[PDB]
Amino acid sequence: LTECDREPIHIPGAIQPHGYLFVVSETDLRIASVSANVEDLLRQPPASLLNVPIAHYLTAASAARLTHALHGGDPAAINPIRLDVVTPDGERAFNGILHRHDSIVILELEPRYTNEFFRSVRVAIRRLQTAADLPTACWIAASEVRRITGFDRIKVYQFAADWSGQVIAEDRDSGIPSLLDFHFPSSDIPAQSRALYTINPVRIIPDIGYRPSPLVPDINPRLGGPIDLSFSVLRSVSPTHLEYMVNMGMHAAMSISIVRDNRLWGMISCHNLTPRFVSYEVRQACELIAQVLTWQIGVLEEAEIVRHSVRMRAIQNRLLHELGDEQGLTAGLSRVSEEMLALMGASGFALCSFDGVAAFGRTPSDDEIQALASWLSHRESRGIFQTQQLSASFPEAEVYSDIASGLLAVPLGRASTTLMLWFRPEVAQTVTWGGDPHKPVRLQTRASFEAWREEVRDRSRPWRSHEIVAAEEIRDLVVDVILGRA
Amino acid sequence: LTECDREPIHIPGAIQPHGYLFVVSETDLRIASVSANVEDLLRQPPASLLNVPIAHYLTAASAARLTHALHGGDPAAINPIRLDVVTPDGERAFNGILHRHDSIVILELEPRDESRYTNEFFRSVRVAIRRLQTAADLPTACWIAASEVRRITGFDRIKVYQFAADWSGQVIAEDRDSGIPSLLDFHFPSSDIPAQSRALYTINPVRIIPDIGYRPSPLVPDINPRLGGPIDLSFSVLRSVSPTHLEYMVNMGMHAAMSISIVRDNRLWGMISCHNLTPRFVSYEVRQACELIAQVLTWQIGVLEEAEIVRHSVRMRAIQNRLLHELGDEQGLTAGLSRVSEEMLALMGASGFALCSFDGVAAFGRTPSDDEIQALASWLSHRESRGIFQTQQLSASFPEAEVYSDIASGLLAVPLGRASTTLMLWFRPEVAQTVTWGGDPHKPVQIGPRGRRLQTRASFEAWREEVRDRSRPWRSHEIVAAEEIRDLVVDVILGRAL
Numbered sequence: 005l006t007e008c009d010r011e012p013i014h015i016p017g018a019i020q021p022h023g024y025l026f027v028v029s030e031t032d033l034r035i036a037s038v039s040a041n042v043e044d045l046l047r048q049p050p051a052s053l054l055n056v057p058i059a060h061y062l063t064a065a066s067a068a069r070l071t072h073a074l075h076g077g078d079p080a081a082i083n084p085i086r087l088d089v090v091t092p093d094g095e096r097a098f099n100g101i102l103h104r105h106d107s108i109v110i111l112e113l114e115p116r117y118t119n120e121f122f123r124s125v126r127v128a129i130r131r132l133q134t135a136a137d138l139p140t141a142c143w144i145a146a147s148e149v150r151r152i153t154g155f156d157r158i159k160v161y162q163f164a165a166d167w168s169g170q171v172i173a174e175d176r177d178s179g180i181p182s183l184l185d186f187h188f189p190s191s192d193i194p195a196q197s198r199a200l201y202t203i204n205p206v207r208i209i210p211d212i213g214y215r216p217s218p219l220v221p222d223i224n225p226r227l228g229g230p231i232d233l234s235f236s237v238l239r240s241v242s243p244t245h246l247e248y249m250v251n252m253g254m255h256a257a258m259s260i261s262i263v264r265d266n267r268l269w270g271m272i273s274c275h276n277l278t279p280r281f282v283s284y285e286v287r288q289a290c291e292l293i294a295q296v297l298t299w300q301i302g303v304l305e306e307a308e309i310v311r312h313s314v315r316m317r318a319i320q321n322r323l324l325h326e327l328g329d330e331q332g333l334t335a336g337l338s339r340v341s342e343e344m345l346a347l348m349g350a351s352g353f354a355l356c357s358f359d360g361v362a363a364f365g366r367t368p369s370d371d372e373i374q375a376l377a378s379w380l381s382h383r384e385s386r387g388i389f390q391t392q393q394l395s396a397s398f399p400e401a402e403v404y405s406d407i408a409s410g411l412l413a414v415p416l417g418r419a420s421t422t423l424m425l426w427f428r429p430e431v432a433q434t435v436t437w438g439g440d441p442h443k444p445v446r447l448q449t450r451a452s453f454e455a456w457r458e459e460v461r462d463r464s465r466p467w468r469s470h471e472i473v474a475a476e477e478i479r480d481l482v483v484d485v486i487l488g489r490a
Numbered sequence: 491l492t493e494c495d496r497e498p499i500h501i502p503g504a505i506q507p508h509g510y511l512f513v514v515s516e517t518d519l520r521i522a523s524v525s526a527n528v529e530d531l532l533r534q535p536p537a538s539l540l541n542v543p544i545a546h547y548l549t550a551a552s553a554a555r556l557t558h559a560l561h562g563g564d565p566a567a568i569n570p571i572r573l574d575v576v577t578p579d580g581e582r583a584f585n586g587i588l589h590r591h592d593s594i595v596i597l598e599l600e601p602r603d604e605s606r607y608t609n610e611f612f613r614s615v616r617v618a619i620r621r622l623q624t625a626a627d628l629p630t631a632c633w634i635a636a637s638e639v640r641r642i643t644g645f646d647r648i649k650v651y652q653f654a655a656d657w658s659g660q661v662i663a664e665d666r667d668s669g670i671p672s673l674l675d676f677h678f679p680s681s682d683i684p685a686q687s688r689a690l691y692t693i694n695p696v697r698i699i700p701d702i703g704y705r706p707s708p709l710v711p712d713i714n715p716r717l718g719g720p721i722d723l724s725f726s727v728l729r730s731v732s733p734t735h736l737e738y739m740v741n742m743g744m745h746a747a748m749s750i751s752i753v754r755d756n757r758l759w760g761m762i763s764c765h766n767l768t769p770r771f772v773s774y775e776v777r778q779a780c781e782l783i784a785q786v787l788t789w790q791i792g793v794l795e796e797a798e799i800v801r802h803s804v805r806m807r808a809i810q811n812r813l814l815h816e817l818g819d820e821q822g823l824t825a826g827l828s829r830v831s832e833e834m835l836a837l838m839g840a841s842g843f844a845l846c847s848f849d850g851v852a853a854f855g856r857t858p859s860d861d862e863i864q865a866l867a868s869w870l871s872h873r874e875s876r877g878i879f880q881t882q883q884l885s886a887s888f889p890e891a892e893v894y895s896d897i898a899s900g901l902l903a904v905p906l907g908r909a910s911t912t913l914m915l916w917f918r919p920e921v922a923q924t925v926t927w928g929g930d931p932h933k934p935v936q937i938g939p940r941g942r943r944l945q946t947r948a949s950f951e952a953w954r955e956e957v958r959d960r961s962r963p964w965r966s967h968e969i970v971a972a973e974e975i976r977d978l979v980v981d982v983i984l985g986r987a988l
């Protein structure tokens with residue numbers, strides 16, 4: 005497990021030959037380190053070229069652009085820089101991808117779009133923005149990716165709390181295999197890969213079986229440690245993970261992080277049969293989709309709540325009056341119980357006092373919710389508690405599996421414990437993974453990615469964010485009436 | 491027309507007889523005043539009920555439901571309240587709409603118009619909302635709110651009306667039943683919803699006139715038991731409205747009207763106006779969902795705006811890049827602009843732009859003469875603002891620009907510094923557009939019998955006008971790329987101190 009976490013993926017001393025790197029002390033822009041693969045391009049030796057002014061390499065026009073872009077700077081949205089390299093053959097040019105990190109400066113060379121193009125992306129974005137829900141937004145995101153990257157398969161993979169994931173949307177060309185609901189374990193994106201991706205959000209491997217060029221030399225020329233190659237686009241990628249890809253059987257891979265409030269939310273993973281490369285530009289457009297999709301994630305969240313303000317208004321009104329006039333509160337509840345229970349996805353709900361309990365629907369008896377309450381107190385919040393699987397973190401609960409696998413708990417008090425608990429019952433479901441996910445490898449890639457299935461119990465259906473808000477708006481009501489009457 | 495503005499619509503002495511008003515001195519909730527039409531429900535007469543336990547008129551449960559609602563105090567979202575009124579003739583059930591104002595309590599009773607609101611209804615508004623939220627652009631979204639409103643209120647015609655800088659507006663979306671006359675795109679003058687109306691509508695967002703030919707029951711009496719003045723029915727739903735307007739409506743062919751305000755950043759943005767040929771009433775519960783649609787619509791306007799921006803990062807990011815690299819790297823900034831000009835212009839949606847200092851001018855595209863921009867910029871200096879300036883008709887505020895109207899009626903002026911010495915101006919040329927009106931907008935009223943200024947004009951047929959002197963509207967997103975372009979010019983210029 006944690007052995008997977010421990011590799012340095014950021015320092016390999018190597019790259020991907022579909023491009024050419026350089027490191028520079030900037031003052032006159034002297035090549036402080038360069039990559040092996042350079043020789044096929046200028047036909048000269050390798051360490052010879054160290055401490056050499058880059059500029060005589062660059063057509064006049066080009067060289068000047070480089071220098072400016074460095075302090076060009078506004079707003080470090082200088083990439084890509086169109087360069088032309090002076091050479092033995094004659095006129096041939098590049099896209100240049102420059103960055104600074106750890107007091108050294110890196111420049112990478114990569115291969116070189118119209119009014120028709122922007123429009124393609126504009127409409128990508130429109131569709132995404134007008135998506136009705138999250139599953140649908142993800143799909144639009146997958147295909148618009150697919151459409152503009154020409155890849156055989158796009159997946160939107162979203163992390164679960166445990167850093168296991170699930171492919172929640174896919175789009176593939178006719179005659180390409182599918183991973184469309186598959187889960188995969190945390191081993192698959194180790195804690196370090198993950199954390200790198202949270203700040204470097206796009207990466208590509210245009211041929212998964214590349215010829216790794218190393219660096220002449222591999223040292224930081226101004227701080228003298230290992231070269232930290234994190235924000236290099238050409239940074240050669242862990243061999244571990246590499247065979248992994250011939251295993252899936254895809255001869256190219258790209259992926260764009262989905263980052264949401266600085267926590268990685270998921271990835272767009274992209275697979276093609278033949279090797280394939282697409283220009284920086286397209287990856288940029290991809291990242292801009294990925295971005296929009298991230299933003300949408302929340303607007304869909306706000307929207308889902310609104311869609312449901314209506315029962316809510318109505319129910320408030322009823323609930324209000326129906327509790328309003330009766331000579332008991334506890335009574336007043338019973339009457340609206342069902343529509344409420346129905347509003348929440350729920351089979352039952354309790355109110356546990358220090359001094360008793362009021363139970364409604366499918367719940368555990370009076371004795372044991374007070375047990376449940378007692379337990380709730382310790383948790384490292386006095387805010388809402390929620391889960392689909394109670395017994396995961398409360399093994400005393402495996403018994404209510406049948407009727408409370410899922411619990412929503414809302415305190416009335418600002419930090420008081422007199423609570424409203426909503427229960428939901430088990431719902432068995434079947435999840436499919438890569439292979440025996442109890443056998444994910446530490447060592448190399450596991451052999452197989454064919455569907456493997458597993459029967460989960462003691463778990464309720466997920467709590468939707470908006471049902472939570474209604475719990476709250478409901479506590480808000482019982483709170484008021486509870487107050488109004490002393 | 492400031493007299494049209496002076497008619498005080500919140501102090502009539504009457505209500506609309508489809509409902510019954512009250513007002514109560516509050517402890518024992520004794521009745522302090524009522525409307526004439528009360529007579530029809532309780533064969534007794536006004537004064538026989540003045541100052542009495544209102545609850546004497548209610549069932550055990552209703553009275554308490556009311557009383558418990560008197561400090562209901564769950565927001566003021568207690569409305570409507572099921573009241574059951576005891577009567578001579580058989581039993582009578584009302585929707586009760588309680589509110590406080592001018593130091594008193596007012597209660598109104600309106601017809602319950604589902605004896606049950608259902609699960610089918612909830613889904614209908616849910617899908618109304620989903621649609622409204624997934625709209626592609628402001629028009630479509632306006633339209634959606636219209637049809638969905640239409641689906642649940644059933645009125646023959648639903649309009650979305652959007653106000654402009656002068657309090658004229660135009661119908662920008664409409665949905666109607668077959669064979670109902672269309673006022674889509676019709677402009678209307680500010681006179682038609684006069685200032686005071688607008689004000690009330692800004693703080694009171696829904697109103698209905700279920701029959702435009704009603705017999706206004708007045709109130710016995712019209713004295714506030716705590717303030718003794720005339721009674722304020724501002725937030726009374728039942729409030730008999732201006733008769734000026736009432737005539738507007740027969741003159742319009744519609745014997746019922748409901749309208750929900752669209753209120754955005756505490757300014758009246760527009761109205762959803764609903765019209766039916768023959769009278770119609772719709773229940774409190776139904777108006778409330780309409781208001782809910784409007785609010786979803788109100789919010790959606792901004793999401794739409796934001797969305798329109800995001801959609802345009804790409805030309806932007808591009809021009810940004812080509813710019814940085816192409817424009818720094820040419821040995822003039824002037825020279826740089828020269829190049830990226832058309833794309834810029836194209837992104838800007840503009841025929842021309844310049845960069846005048848106090849000490850020079852750099853013009854690109856089709857612009858005014860240098861002398862003429864040099865003067866624009868002086869004038870721009872006296873304005874009391876230092877931010878973006880925008881007009882579709884420059885000559886309206888700067889009449890000396892009439893001359894260049896043909897090539898710059900629209901100006902988007904954006905300052906480099908906070909010191910507004912040197913600015914980047916974008917030009918757009920007058921454009922022909924033909925717009926159509928309610929009636930002639932040049933006599934928006936006529937003198938009524940006895941010599942006053944309150945008659946609605948006789949007709950709302952298309953009147954058309956050719957307008958040639960105003961440019962294309964400056965769009966929110968366009969302004970943004972201007973700001974962004976500015977930001978780039980700045981770096982170069984800064985970068986190049988020396």
Ligand SMILES: */C=C/C1=C(C)C(=O)N/C1=C\C1=NC(=C\c2[nH]c(/C=C3\NC(=O)C(C=C)=C3C)c(C)c2CCC(=O)O)/C(CCC(=O)O)=C1C
Nearest residue numbers: 008013188191192197241242245257258259273444445446
């Ligand atoms: C503990 C070693 C590893 C096991 C076992 C394993 O399965 N992976 C292991 C290490 C790494 N994976 C790296 C990158 C990476 N992994 C994925 C995994 C997926 N690709 C998919 O398409 C899906 C699901 C549909 C999954 C779960 C991706 C997308 C990536 C990023 C690159 C890409 O595939 O496009 C990785 C990082 C190496 C590095 O970046 O240097 C390691 C170490």
Ligand SMILES: */C=C/C1=C(C)C(=O)N/C1=C\C1=NC(=C\c2[nH]c(/C=C3\NC(=O)C(C=C)=C3C)c(C)c2CCC(=O)O)/C(CCC(=O)O)=C1C
Nearest residue numbers: 494499678681682683687731732734735747748749763934
């Ligand atoms: C200055 C005298 C008035 C003229 C002339 C006039 O046209 N209106 C005048 C006064 C009032 N109008 C009132 C309410 C009101 N007006 C409108 C106007 C429109 N309705 C439409 O559908 C369109 C265009 C398609 C327009 C321009 C509306 C919508 C309303 C609100 C009621 C409704 O929905 O019909 C008014 C207020 C009376 C009150 O509320 O007491 C006054 C005084």
